[PDB]
Structure formats: structure tokens, C-alpha cells
Design an enzyme around this catalytic site. Structure first.
Site, PDB file in Angstrom:
ATOM      1  N   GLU A  28       1.136  -1.255   0.096  1.00  0.00           N
ATOM      2  CA  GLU A  28      -0.027  -0.045   0.151  1.00  0.00           C
ATOM      3  C   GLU A  28       0.722   1.257  -0.131  1.00  0.00           C
ATOM      4  OE1 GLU A  28      -4.560  -0.673   0.563  1.00  0.00           O
ATOM      5  OE2 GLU A  28      -3.093  -1.361   2.152  1.00  0.00           O
ATOM      6  N   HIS A  79      -5.927 -41.789 -22.238  1.00  0.00           N
ATOM      7  CA  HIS A  79      -6.978 -41.946 -21.321  1.00  0.00           C
ATOM      8  C   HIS A  79      -7.550 -40.909 -20.633  1.00  0.00           C
ATOM      9  CE1 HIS A  79      -3.766 -42.097 -18.592  1.00  0.00           C
ATOM     10  NE2 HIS A  79      -3.182 -43.507 -18.948  1.00  0.00           N
TER      11      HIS A  79
HETATM   12  N1  LIG Z   1      -1.441   5.965   7.470  1.00  0.00           N
HETATM   13  C1  LIG Z   1      -2.309   5.918   6.702  1.00  0.00           C
HETATM   14  N2  LIG Z   1      -2.600   6.963   5.690  1.00  0.00           N
HETATM   15  C2  LIG Z   1      -3.511   7.008   4.806  1.00  0.00           C
HETATM   16  N3  LIG Z   1      -4.153   6.095   4.592  1.00  0.00           N
HETATM   17  C3  LIG Z   1      -4.048   4.812   5.324  1.00  0.00           C
HETATM   18  C4  LIG Z   1      -3.040   4.992   6.270  1.00  0.00           C
HETATM   19  N4  LIG Z   1      -3.225   3.644   6.802  1.00  0.00           N
HETATM   20  C5  LIG Z   1      -4.127   2.988   6.155  1.00  0.00           C
HETATM   21  N5  LIG Z   1      -4.811   3.772   5.316  1.00  0.00           N
HETATM   22  C6  LIG Z   1      -5.499   3.380   4.325  1.00  0.00           C
HETATM   23  O1  LIG Z   1      -6.726   2.873   4.777  1.00  0.00           O
HETATM   24  C7  LIG Z   1      -6.689   1.356   4.798  1.00  0.00           C
HETATM   25  C8  LIG Z   1      -6.444   0.631   6.193  1.00  0.00           C
HETATM   26  O2  LIG Z   1      -5.458  -0.530   5.888  1.00  0.00           O
HETATM   27  P1  LIG Z   1      -5.286  -1.208   7.035  1.00  0.00           P
HETATM   28  O3  LIG Z   1      -6.394  -1.426   8.351  1.00  0.00           O
HETATM   29  O4  LIG Z   1      -4.242  -0.839   7.538  1.00  0.00           O
HETATM   30  O5  LIG Z   1      -5.376  -2.912   6.403  1.00  0.00           O
HETATM   31  P2  LIG Z   1      -6.564  -3.162   5.917  1.00  0.00           P
HETATM   32  O6  LIG Z   1      -6.499  -3.013   4.330  1.00  0.00           O
HETATM   33  O7  LIG Z   1      -7.789  -2.030   6.106  1.00  0.00           O
HETATM   34  N6  LIG Z   1      -7.223  -4.600   6.271  1.00  0.00           N
HETATM   35  P3  LIG Z   1      -5.792  -5.481   6.806  1.00  0.00           P
HETATM   36  O8  LIG Z   1      -4.709  -5.188   5.768  1.00  0.00           O
HETATM   37  O9  LIG Z   1      -5.976  -6.894   6.801  1.00  0.00           O
HETATM   38  O10 LIG Z   1      -5.391  -5.269   8.224  1.00  0.00           O
HETATM   39  C9  LIG Z   1      -5.463   1.122   3.856  1.00  0.00           C
HETATM   40  O11 LIG Z   1      -6.302   0.153   2.743  1.00  0.00           O
HETATM   41  C10 LIG Z   1      -5.233   2.426   3.167  1.00  0.00           C
HETATM   42  O12 LIG Z   1      -5.803   2.548   1.920  1.00  0.00           O
HETATM   43 MG   LIG Z   2      -4.328  -3.789   4.237  1.00  0.00          MG
END
Ligand SMILES: Nc1ncnc2c1ncn2[C@@H]1O[C@H](COP(=O)(O)OP(=O)(O)NP(=O)(O)O)[C@@H](O)[C@H]1O
Ligand SMILES: [Mg+2]
Ligand SMILES: CO[C@H]1/C=C/O[C@@]2(C)Oc3c(C)c(O)c4c(O)c(c(/C=N/N5CCN(C)CC5)c(O)c4c3C2=O)NC(=O)/C(C)=C\C=C\[C@H](C)[C@H](O)[C@@H](C)[C@@H](O)[C@@H](C)[C@H](OC(C)=O)[C@@H]1C
Length: 847
Positions: free
Chosen positions: A297, A805
Site C-alpha cells: 500500500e 486415457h
Molecule cells: N497512515 C495511513 N494514511 C493514509 N491512508 C491509510 C493509512 N493507513 C491505512 N490507510 C488506508 O486505509 C486502509 C486501512 O488499511 P489497514 O487497516 O492498515 O489494513 P486493511 O487493508 O484495512 N485490512 P488489513 O490489511 O488485513 O489489516 C488501507 O487500505 C489504506 O488505503
Molecule cells: Mg491492508
């Protein structure tokens, strides 16, 4: 395992038990130079255990939760509501809050916004994923809000959905905890996901970006739409641009809101081409650091890329461990053998130990390495034309692979066969006796000498000459009688009811064993309703039992070695589980009257004397007429002598395999007594050499076996490709509808005739309840599957090839069959009336 909080910088390797998977990978990522991970810390599983798992009501509630199944649904709705509300009502101990206040000020401070993200672990399963299972809340400001959302995260461990997931994946609720990632928010222009290896192709070489404007929560939850770009080397193969209606943005005072993008903004390319290549490089550095492809990500803020999650990928089809250099192309054994089921290593090794091909392994199945063949001048070009006479898609798949990033720079005697067969029968007779004397490391020492003997009857030059004699002759007849008489795939009908086909006899003999059960209604009622594995020892009770058990026992002594997946030594043979033959013995009791095997066999040889003597007569008033005739009759006699035998060498091979299997299980049970193995059949997860060392040395590596065990699971879920590449691209060929009805499903003709009937899509022969009309649609159909060819009107498979077969068995049964059918079992619906043409190779979804 003491601290309540750890900054990403403080996290040591293998700290999943404390910080969770997400937290750990964030820690790891934050120490890679050139990688910007927004500062933060983990509220540790300690805080969770301290606050919740030490609470008597909580533990009592979870002890209750331990007791229930997915079917205890309303107990799940209510007990989890209790747990959740209990969690949100439990205050976080002031001591924990103090440690957090300190660490938070370091990143800093309570006026700044943070992401609050769940991080789970299962005890002693450090790498277990809980992807998309628990909560995250973005842009949280203030201590009060922070504490509130930590409890909310904790509670999200106990949604009905998270609980059901754990039950189904056999996670113990008492041994899963949640860490909480608390991280500086990025306020980005763009965000998204990165997959270090294309989810299409699966080619380990392309990259992929999903990109949206704004915060990443939209793309993940799961709308907005997103841009898609693929970059192959350092060049961008593809760009896609979604119409992105919405974007999520952070509010200055906390929380989040969705906005609508201006119409002219919705169609803009999220990332510039330069940014795309920069991100790709960024991403290539984290598998390169991590060593396997990754799921990442990211955020783009003011031209800077921020990494916000990384996580191993879990879906790709593995690559062969090749000891060769340069680009390699592998061909799939599964497709030619009609198997495609994952195999266990012990079984995998025994196939390898018996082939003179350059076979390798990937994902529990076998591939042949045929690149050096491909490279040479005029041996390629041997192979592609030759491999196209069994499987057009292979030929197609090879043309497609020779166009890449320079990826590329004697008939024996009549009396031959019965001597061949009996010389095998005896070779096995000897065998059966000589192992009942061997044991321990003597056993293993002996199996290897015997592998030499296996190879000797299997690959006897005389055997092969007898095998091809049949093939070659129906090659000749099909090519020539289409040339003269025209309009003919004639060897199909000429092969009908061929004599001495040990596998056609098998399916046809079950017709007789049912003729024995038919009179006795005592046994038929028992057999109709039984899950008892040794039902065969309860038969002597009933009036038919004694007679029945005999009928069955003799069938099993003749065919009991054979089972679906026979090539895999580790799979339950029929004789080891006779109950699997019952539904077939049962349902062809009801589909047939007495003496059905006689009438099916007769009418076949009747219906091929007629073609014999039609073609011969019809050839008489051709120009050179009674000559052309006599050379064909010559080929028909030849044909119908050596077509049976075509299926014998596998039957000899396997018999050995089951004899070896019995011996190797003895050693495995002998290994249990000595306390060296946990489970008696754990010897299926060691290759034959590793297994040698174990009896030899009395030592095993269970952290290995368990990984074999685990790996096996995540194969099965795979489906081998027709062709596999060093890069792990998968290539199934594409067929050519020349002037075939459009909207047809294309396959290989194999066995002649057109027929219309009910599609029955079945993956297990046992659960197959075939009826008179039915057209059997399945995945593979090895000799194991014959007994089910007696009621159906036509066959369809996903895999195979002319002369392999049980394509060969459809011809003799006089069954129309089409074979190379991309995704038959998924494309066709069980019950859909359907038309198959096994002359031209196609399928029509009749209304
Ligand atoms: N610090 C951050 N700043 C901006 N966007 C964030 C941040 N952390 C997470 N996100 C976004 O919000 C979502 C939260 O992800 P996260 O909860 O860390 O895992 P999840 O994809 O929701 N489920 P999982 O990966 O199994 O724990 C992510 O898919 C990002 O798109
Ligand atoms: Mg995630
Ligand atoms: C298109 O089919 C060909 C593929 C070529 O390409 C190529 C590169 O890809 C292959 C694939 C995908 C295989 O799975 C394979 C294989 O499983 C096998 C041998 C070993 N073959 N021979 C080596 C020399 N030895 C003298 C005889 C054994 C192979 O070479 C191959 C093989 C190739 O070599 N072996 C065995 O399976 C074993 C343990 C026993 C088989 C026994 C019977 C006897 C075989 O069925 C005979 C009857 C023929 O059926 C096959 C040879 C096929 O030939 C035809 C005409 O159909 C062959 C699959």
C-alpha cells in the site's frame, strides 16, 4: 514480551506475537533506506491481554465462544454482541495510557492526526493473514478519540464475520490477539495498491498499480474505482484510466469525508508516467528486500511516495527449481495424464524416480523442461508439430512463446502382447513376495533395485513397439480414409469394443458385479445407506451378503489398486476404501438390466464390423480399388490388436506403486512405534530420499513436514497451466473456430459423434449420480473414471488429448467426447441441456 508500546524503529524481527503482522512489516519497511514509512508505533498485544484477556467475564465469554460452530449462528450473534459491548465498556488501564502518551508525543503529539489500524496475530502462526478482517479508522485527533478507537479496533476482532472466519480457518479465539498500529496520517493527492507481479499472466516480471485520487479507504472498501497500469521491464506495457467519481479526504478537525470530483478531473490519469515507473522501482525494492513478490500500500503526497503497508503475496503458481540457466519453458504433465490434482511429495518423487524425461515440480504437480529442444534448429520444429498431434493448444502455446523478449534466441508379432502382459503379471508376482521380507532400510534399498525392473517392463522396446502399433495404425486410417472416402474420422468407430483393454474391462465388469447385487434386496438396502468403511464385513449378515462380498472382493483383486490419481502413490486406492465404488455399483444397478456388459460389448463389435466392411466395400469402386482396400484391412487388424495394450503399461506401473505403498506404510507405522513420527501417513510429505534418511538416522524435521503439509494446502487451490514459463507466466492455448458455430465452446474432437443431453458437472466420481441422458462434464478423467462411462451419452473434460486415457476409452465405448475444454466445469452449468460434437470439436449450450 513485556512492553505496551513500540515505535516502528524499535521492532525486532519475528515480533508478530507482540505487534501483529501489519505492525511487523511496517517495522521492517521503516528500516529500508529510500523507503519512507510515516512515523508511528504499535500498541502491543500486551495492552490487549492486560486490558481484556485478564478479565474474568471476558475469558468466560471467550471460553463459551470456544464451544460453538458456524451452525450455532444465533449463539454467535449474541455472544459476540456481548463481547463487543464489553470491550467498548472496558476502560484502558491508566498505566498503559501513560506509556502511550509518552510515545505519542514522540511522533508527536495529541494535536496531530493518526491512523488507527488493527494488527492481528494467531499464536504460533506468526504469518497467518487476517487480511480484510478487522477495522481501521483514519485521521483521528486527540487522546480521547484515540483511546475510543483503540477499543473499537479491539472490538472489531469480535464481529460475527471475524469470528466465522476464525472458526472456518481453525484459529482458536483464545489464541488470537490484536495489536493496534498508531501512525501519522499522510494527506495524499493519490493512494493505492501495488502488486510486484501481475495478477493476470502471473508473470513474475510485470508490475501493477491500482491508483486513485485521495485517501486509500475508497479503493479498499471497495469503491471508488481505480486506475490500472502494467510495467514489464522498465517500459510501460499498459495504462488504464478509470472514471473516478469519488475521492476521500481528511477533515482538518478529524475524521473523513467523501467528495465528488469535477467531471474533468474524474478521467485524469492518477499518476504520471514518470511517477508510475518510479513507484514500480520502489516496489521492486521490497520484494528484492523481501525475496518473494509482495502486496504493497502506498501514498503520494507532494511528489513523495510513502509506504503504508506491505504483505507477502499468496496466489501465484510456483516456479520449478531448475538447475539450468536462462529462460525456461515447461510443459504440463497433468494435462497429458488427465490428472491436474495436486500430488504429495512422496508420490511426486516416485514419478520422478521413474521417468527418463527432464521432469521438475511446481505446486504439487509435474512439469517437463523442454527448452533445449526448443532452441536448436529443426528440433523445435520437430516438437511443436509432434506435440500438436496430441494437443493443438500446446502447439498454439508454443508459437506464442517463441515470439517473446527474445525468450528464444516395426510392428511386433500377434503373439507379442500376451507375452508382454504375462511377463508383467509374473514380474509383479515375484515382487509381491520379495518385499514381504524386506523392511527398514532394506526396504528402501530394494525399492530402488525394483524401480529398475519397473522401468524395464514399462519401457521395454517391444512394449513400445506394440503400443505405437495401435496409435500409428489409427493415424494411418484416419488420415487416409478421410483422404479417399472423404468425410471420415474412421478409427473411432473401428476401435469400438476393441479386445483386451484392461481399463475398458474394468468399467464394464462393474456392470456384472451389480448383476450379483441386484437379486438380493437385503444388501441393496444396506449399500444404499452406508458410510461405514468396513461395510464389507457386515455383509455376511444379510441374505445376499456372502455372494456379494465375493463379487466385490474379486473385482477389487483385479482393479483394487487403481484409484483416481493413481499416479500419486499417496492416494487412497479403491481397495483401501471400497465404499467409494458403491454409488457407481448402486446407480448402475438401477440404470441397467441383467447382462448389460455383454450387450454393450457385442453391439460395439457389431458396429465396427459394419464400418470395417462398409469402408472396404466402398473403397472398391475407387480408382485403385481392391488394392487400397487390402492395405486398410491390414491396418484395421493391426489396429484392433494393439489398442487394448495401449492402456496396459500404466496398469503394470501402478500395481507396483500400490505394492510399494503398502511396504512404505509399514515402515511408517514402524516409525511411529519408535516414536520418531507423529502420524503414520506423515511420510507422504517427505520425498523418497528424505524418507530414506529418516529410517536410517531416526531423525526428522517436523517444522519441515508441517510446511510441506501447509504448502500442499495452498496448492490444490492452484490449477496447472498447459504451459509454464521461468517467469511463471501461464499459457493455455487458444483454439481455432474456423467455420464452427460462433457461441460454441471449442475443444478437441477425440471421439466421434454428435449428441444432446443433460450436463452433469461432477468433480468427484463418488458424488456422481449419472442417469441415462447425461453428458458428463468434469476436469480430468483418468483410468479411475471409466466405471462411470456406462450410463452417459457423451463426455467433456477440461484437459487431455487424443490418444490419452480416457479419451482412448470413449472411442471404444462409442461415446462422443470433446476434451481440451477451457473451463468446462465453470462455464457449463450442471443441468443445462447441452450439445456436444465430438467430430468437429465443439459444444453448444442448448437452451
Ligand atoms: N497512515 C495511513 N494514511 C493514509 N491512508 C491509510 C493509512 N493507513 C491505512 N490507510 C488506508 O486505509 C486502509 C486501512 O488499511 P489497514 O487497516 O492498515 O489494513 P486493511 O487493508 O484495512 N485490512 P488489513 O490489511 O488485513 O489489516 C488501507 O487500505 C489504506 O488505503
Ligand atoms: Mg491492508
Ligand atoms: C505427447 O506425448 C509425449 C510427450 C512428449 O514430450 C515430452 C517432453 O513431454 C512429456 C510429458 C508431458 C510427459 O508427461 C512425459 C511422461 O510422462 C513420460 C515420458 C517418457 N517417455 N518415454 C521416454 C522414452 N522411453 C522410451 C519411453 C518413455 C515423457 O517423455 C514425457 C514427456 C516428453 O517427453 N513418461 C511417463 O509418463 C512414464 C513414467 C511412463 C509412460 C509410459 C507410456 C509408455 C507413455 O504413455 C508412452 C506410451 C507415450 O504415451 C508417451 C511417451 C508420450 O508419447 C506419445 C506418443 O504420446 C509422451 C507423453
Amino acid at each position: 514480551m513485556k512492553p505496551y508500546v513500540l515505535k516502528f524503529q524499535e521492532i525486532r524481527p519475528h515480533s508478530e506475537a507482540l505487534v501483529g503482522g501489519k505492525g511487523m512489516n511496517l517495522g521492517a519497511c521503516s528500516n529500508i533506506e529510500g523507503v519512507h514509512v510515516p512515523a508511528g508505533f504499535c500498541l502491543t498485544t500486551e495492552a490487549y491481554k492486560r486490558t481484556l484477556a485478564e478479565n474474568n467475564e471476558f475469558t468466560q465469554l471467550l471460553q463459551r465462544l470456544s464451544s460453538l460452530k458456524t451452525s450455532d449462528m444465533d449463539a454467535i450473534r449474541e455472544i459476540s454482541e456481548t463481547i463487543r459491548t464489553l470491550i467498548q465498556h472496558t476502560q484502558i488501564p491508566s498505566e498503559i495510557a501513560s506509556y502511550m502518551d509518552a510515545t505519542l508525543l514522540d511522533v508527536g503529539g495529541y494535536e496531530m492526526p493518526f491512523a488507527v489500524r488493527s494488527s492481528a496475530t494467531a499464536e504460533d502462526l506468526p504469518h497467518a493473514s487476517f487480511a480484510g478482517q478487522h477495522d481501521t479508522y483514519l485521521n483521528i485527533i486527540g487522546k480521547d478519540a484515540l483511546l475510543q478507537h483503540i477499543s473499537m479496533c479491539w472490538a472489531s476482532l469480535f464481529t460475527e464475520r471475524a469470528i466465522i472466519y476464525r472458526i472456518q480457518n481453525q484459529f482458536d479465539h483464545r489464541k488470537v490477539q490484536l495489536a493496534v498500529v498508531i501512525q501519522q496520517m499522510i494527506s495524499p493527492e493519490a493512494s493505492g495498491i501495488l502488486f510486484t507481479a501481475d495478477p493476470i499472466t502471473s508473470n513474475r516480471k510485470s508490475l501493477s498499480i491500482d491508483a486513485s485520487f485521495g485517501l486509500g479507504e475508497a479503493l479498499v472498501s471497495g469503491l471508488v474505482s481505480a486506475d490500472s497500469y502494467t510495467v514489464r521491464e522498465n517500459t510501460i506495457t499498459n495504462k488504464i484510466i478509470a472514471t473516478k467519481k469519488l475521492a476521500i479526504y481528511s477533515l482538518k478537525e478529524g475524521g473523513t469525508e467523501t467528495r465528488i470530483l469535477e467531471k474533468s478531473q474524474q478521467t485524469k490519469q492518477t499518476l504520471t508516467d514518470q511517477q508510475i515507473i518510479q513507484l514500480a522501482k520502489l516496489g521492486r525494492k521490497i520484494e528484492a528486500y523481501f525475496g518473494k513478490p509482495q502486496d504493497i500500500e502506498w501514498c503520494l503526497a507532494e511528489g513523495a511516495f510513502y509506504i503504508v503497508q506491505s504483505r507477502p503475496i499468496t496466489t501465484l503458481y510456483p516456479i520449478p527449481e531448475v538447475n539450468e540457466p536462462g529462460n525456461r519453458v515447461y510443459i504440463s504433465v497433468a494435462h497429458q495424464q488427465m490428472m491436474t490434482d495436486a500430488m504429495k511429495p512422496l508420490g511426486l518423487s516416485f514419478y520422478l524416480m521413474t521417468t527418463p524425461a527432464t521432469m521438475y515440480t511446481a505446486g504439487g504437480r509435474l512439469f517437463v523442461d523442454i527448452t533445449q529442444s526448443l532452441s536448436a534448429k529443426v528440433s523445435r520444429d520437430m516438437m511443436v508439430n509432434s506435440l500438436g498431434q496430441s494437443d493443438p493448444l500446446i502447439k498454439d502455446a508454443l508459437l506464442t512463446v517463441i515470439n517473446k523478449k527474445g525468450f528464444l534466441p516395426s510392428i511386433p508379432d500377434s503373439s507379442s502382447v500376451f507375452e508382454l502382459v504375462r511377463n508383467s503379471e509374473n514380474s509383479i508376482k515375484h515382487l509381491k513376495q520379495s518385499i514381504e521380507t524386506k523392511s527398514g532400510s532394506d526396504l528402501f534399498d530394494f525399492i530402488v533395485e525394483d524401480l529398475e525392473e519397473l522401468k524395464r517392463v514399462l519401457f521395454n522396446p517391444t512394449s513400445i513397439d506394440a503400443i505405437m502399433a495401435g496409435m500409428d495404425a489409427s493415424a494411418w486410417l484416419n488420415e487416409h480414409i478421410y483422404q479417399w472416402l472423404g468425410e471420415k474420422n474412421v478409427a473411432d468407430k473401428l476401435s469400438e469394443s476393441a479386445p483386451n483393454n484392461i481399463t475398458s474391462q474394468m468399467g464394464l465388469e462393474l456392470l456384472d458385479v451389480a448383476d450379483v447385487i441386484r437379486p438380493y434386496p437385503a444388501v441393496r438396502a444396506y449399500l444404499e445407506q452406508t458410510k461405514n468403511p468396513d461395510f464389507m464385513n457386515e455383509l455376511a449378515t444379510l441374505e445376499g451378503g456372502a455372494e456379494t462380498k465375493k463379487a466385490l472382493e474379486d473385482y477389487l483383486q483385479k482393479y483394487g489398486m487403481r484409484c483416481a490419481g493413481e499416479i500419486d502413490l499417496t492416494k487412497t486406492r479403491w481397495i483401501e476404501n471400497p465404499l467409494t465404488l458403491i454409488p457407481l455399483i448402486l446407480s448402475n444397478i438401477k440404470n441397467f438390466d441383467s447382462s448389460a456388459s455383454m450387450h454393450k460389448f457385442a453391439q460395439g463389435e457389431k458396429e465396427a464390423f459394419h464400418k470395417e466392411q462398409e469402408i472396404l466395400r466402398r473403397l472398391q469402386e475407387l480408382p485403385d480399388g481392391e488394392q487400397k482396400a487390402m492395405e486398410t484391412k491390414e491396418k484395421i487388424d493391426i489396429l484392433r490388436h494393439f489398442i487394448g495394450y495401449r492402456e496396459y503399461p500404466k496398469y503394470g506401473m501402478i500395481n507396483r506403486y500400490f505394492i510399494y505403498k503398502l511396504a512404505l506404510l509399514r515402515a511408517g507405522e514402524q516409525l511411529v512405534k519408535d516414536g520418531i513420527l507423529q502420524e503414520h501417513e506423515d511420510i507422504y510429505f517427505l520425498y523418497f530420499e528424505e524418507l530414506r534418511e529418516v529410517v536410517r538416522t531416526g531423525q526428522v524435521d517436523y517444522e519441515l513436514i508441517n510446511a510441506r503439509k501447509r504448502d500442499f494446502a495452498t496448492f490444490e487451490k492452484l490449477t496447472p497451466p498447459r504451459i509454464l514459463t521461468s517467469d511463471g507466466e501461464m499459457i493455455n492455448g487458444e483454439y481455432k473456430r474456423e467455420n464452427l458455430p460462433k457461441d460454441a465452446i471449442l475443444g478437441l474432437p477425440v471421439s466421434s459423434g454428435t449428441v444432446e443431453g443433460r450436463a452433469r458437472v461432477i468433480l468427484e466420481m463418488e458424488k456422481a449420480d449419472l442417469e441415462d441422458g447425461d453428458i458428463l462434464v468434469t476436469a480430468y478423467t483418468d483410468p479411475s473414471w471409466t466405471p462411470a462411462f456406462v450410463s452417459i451419452k457423451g463426455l467433456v473434460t477440461e484437459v487431455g488429448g487424443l490418444m490419452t486415457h480416457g479419451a482412448v476409452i470413449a472411442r471404444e465405448y462409442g461415446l462422443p467426447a470433446v476434451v481440451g475444454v477451457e473451463n468446462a466445469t465453470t462455464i457449463i452449468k450442471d443441468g443445462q441441456q447441452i450439445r456436444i460434437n465430438g467430430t468437429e470439436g465443439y459444444i453448444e449450450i442448448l437452451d
